[PDB]
Amino acid sequence: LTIEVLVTVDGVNFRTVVLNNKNTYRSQLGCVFFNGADISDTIPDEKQNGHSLYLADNLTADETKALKELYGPVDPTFLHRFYSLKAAVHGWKMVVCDKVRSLKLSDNNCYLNAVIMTLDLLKDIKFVIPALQHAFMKHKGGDSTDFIALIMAYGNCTFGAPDDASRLLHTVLAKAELCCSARMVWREWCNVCGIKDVVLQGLKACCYVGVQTVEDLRARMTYVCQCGGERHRQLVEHTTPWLLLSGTPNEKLVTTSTAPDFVAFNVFQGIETAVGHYVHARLKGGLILKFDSGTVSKTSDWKCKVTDVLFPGQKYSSDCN
């Protein structure tokens, strides 16, 4: 017997391949996926004539190029790994408590919940890799399975295993781009040796790892100079649409009574002897809204180990320092 199928790697371009029913899909084409399931070792099963197949191996020159333009430069196990994740995360629930989406707790995915909910608050954000954008747009439309699977694929997350939210958030942002002007100017100087300016722009200006408050970010750093004197590092200019600050689990008392400038923050929970639980939290109304994967809580004060903290747009100059 003989059947003919449609073969794609992107869902846009298709080629027709004629297959017999003696050999396996593996020996005839390569690693093929049909509606989620891997069928590489199976014999072309009669009734599946004229169906679309997603290929992962033995890509043609045209397929390799289109694969690169859509996903960017990825390792050759990326597709199999991405398709497997799409099928695995299909039974995951997004719940919307008062018009805010959150990922339900399933198979240690609370780190993803923190990643997604933090990404939702970032404005003027665009992904340079086309496949991420299409999935990002789908996610914003209510269909988030592609985005989750891609984030796990690019982050090299395995299904079922716990992971780091900050780690994943920074790796995802590396693939993103800002739609407006951002500027960050650091000043390194010595009273004898002179002045040096370091300028960052784009998402580079909007992200910082080391400090978790804006007062600490603007503070002056001092160490020994080449000349034997003193060197100083301090922020001079800062113009952003928003500011994300990150650090390791750092215990802080968070209070609404002081009216904090930050909009939201992530929290690592559980003792260091048994690690793997994240919580997203937003400041809305006069309260702290705690999002523990589906469930929602409210407190005015909270002593917690904060990791990532998101601030509004900065517009600052070092006031006569």
Place this chain on the structure above:
Amino acid sequence: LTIEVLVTVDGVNFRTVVLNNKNTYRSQLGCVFFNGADISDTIPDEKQNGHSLYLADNLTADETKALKELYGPVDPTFLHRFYSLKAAVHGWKMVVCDKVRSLKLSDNNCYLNAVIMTLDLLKDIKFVIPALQHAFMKHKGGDSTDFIALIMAYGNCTFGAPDDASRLLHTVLAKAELCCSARMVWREWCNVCGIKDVVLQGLKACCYVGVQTVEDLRARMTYVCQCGGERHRQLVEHTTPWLLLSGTPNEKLVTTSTAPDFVAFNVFQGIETAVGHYVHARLKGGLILKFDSGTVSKTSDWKCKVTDVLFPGQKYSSDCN
């Protein structure tokens, strides 16, 4: 009181920082490591004056640049993640059964055993990222903790979790480079539409995912053409120092009686319902040497699910096809 310390991110360049005993290391410097252990939240502990500290946060312009030149472009959680792994994999054993090193079974690291043992057989291989080379040279000298920790860091492997050997092997090789000439020429053609040649070189020529035998790699692929006729894909020229072929767990009968051309291969073991066990195997003498993380076995025949397969240097032209 007041103490002064040496701060590095590379072990080469050091700056002197003067620290008081009121604040934490975190608020004064940032994320600091001393002899493996994270001490960011601790108060500068008196006797640790004039000691070297490894910093992960709040890097100076000079530190950021040197960090980039040594490790390449990495996400801002890379250092903390790398230092934590160095301390974690310190109690791992390399055993040498008849002048061949293998990584002992510990915390599901059998995938690393396969990765390392396969890398050991690759000749004329050099890493473009300086930190990988220094660790690779250390590894070859008998000290492998740095290399393992780096591979886990770049592969985004977590300590204790199982992982994919092919996945890791391809991501590691992406950072490598060949010290000689390699060439791979694929020919895509149609009898009506014409001929098109696709040329690959370097490690690109020495690696292929899709087929696991050289006969299949040289075989002709056929599908429907744009013109309505037939398109063909076939390898024409192939000159390499060695050839690595990869595929998913594929059940094969491996026999020494046929005298196979391949030197070594990796095997995925265990049912798909409970995944996570790899085995490295080399053909030496008249037998198959099975390396199951420390332990060694011998058989003449073996029905197993092969993944990666390594061949000697290719020198081939399509013989009047």
